[PDB]
UniProtKB/Swiss-Prot annotation:
Superkingdom of the source species: Eukaryota
Quaternary structure (record): Component of the IFT complex A (IFT-A) complex. IFT-A complex is divided into a core subcomplex composed of IFT122:IFT140:WDR19 which is associated with TULP3 and a peripheral subcomplex composed of IFT43:WDR35:TTC21B. Interacts with IFT43:WDR35; the interaction connects the 2 IFT-A subcomplexes. Interacts with IFTAP; the interaction associates IFTAP with IFT-A complex.
Originating organism: Homo sapiens (Human)
Organs and tissues of expression: Expressed in many tissues. Predominant expression in testis and pituitary.
Record disease entry: Cranioectodermal dysplasia 1: A disorder characterized by craniofacial, skeletal and ectodermal abnormalities. Clinical features include dolichocephaly (with or without sagittal suture synostosis), scaphocephaly, short stature, limb shortening, short ribs, narrow chest, brachydactyly, renal failure and hepatic fibrosis, small and abnormally shaped teeth, sparse hair, skin laxity and abnormal nails.
Gene of this entry: IFT122
Function: As a component of the IFT complex A (IFT-A), a complex required for retrograde ciliary transport and entry into cilia of G protein-coupled receptors (GPCRs), it is required in ciliogenesis and ciliary protein trafficking. Involved in cilia formation during neuronal patterning. Acts as a negative regulator of Shh signaling. Required to recruit TULP3 to primary cilia.
Name of the featured protein: Intraflagellar transport protein 122 homolog
Places the protein is found: Cell projection, Cilium; Cytoplasm, Cytoskeleton, Cilium basal body
Domain statement: Forms the trimeric core subcomplex IFT122:IFT140:WDR19 via the C-terminal region, whereas it interacts with IFT43:WDR35 via the N-terminal region containing the WD repeats.
First and last residues shown, out of full length: 746 to 869 of 1241
Length: 124
């Protein structure tokens, strides 16, 4: 019942065009999906990395969306850090291929030989 009140208050705060507090009590409500959606709509790296670093590891999809927004924004390294934290090293190496980080991706593939075999042929 408190969650309903916080979600309604946050949606109202967004609707009056005050996304700052709206995201603030999105996060306080445990509604990180809507929080990340609004943050990506406004492209605010600060609170995006804040919530992504304070999100639960088991929240695989919220962290994937966090890293997706980070890579979509001008923060590829932040997306790489989020990918490494959540545990999808395959997508980390795919990002390093996308970010033209040849040496970093080669080191990662040394750490994960399957990742090297999969995503170092594109470097070839």
């Amino acid at each position: 019942e408190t969650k309903m009140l916080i979600t309604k208050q946050a949606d109202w705060a967004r609707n009056i065009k005050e996304p700052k507090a709206a995201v603030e009590m999105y996060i306080s409500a445990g509604e990180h999906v809507k929080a990340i959606e609004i943050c990506g709509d406004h492209g605010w790296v600060d609170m995006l990395i804040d919530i992504a670093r304070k999100l639960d590891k088991a929240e695989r999809e919220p962290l994937l969306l966090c890293a997706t927004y980070l890579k979509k924004l001008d923060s590829p390294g932040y997306a790489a850090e989020t990918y490494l934290k959540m545990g999808d090293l395959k997508s980390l190496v795919q990002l390093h291929v996308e970010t033209q980080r040849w040496d970093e991706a080669f080191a990662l593939g040394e750490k994960h030989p399957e990742f090297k075999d999969d995503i170092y042929m594109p470097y070839a």
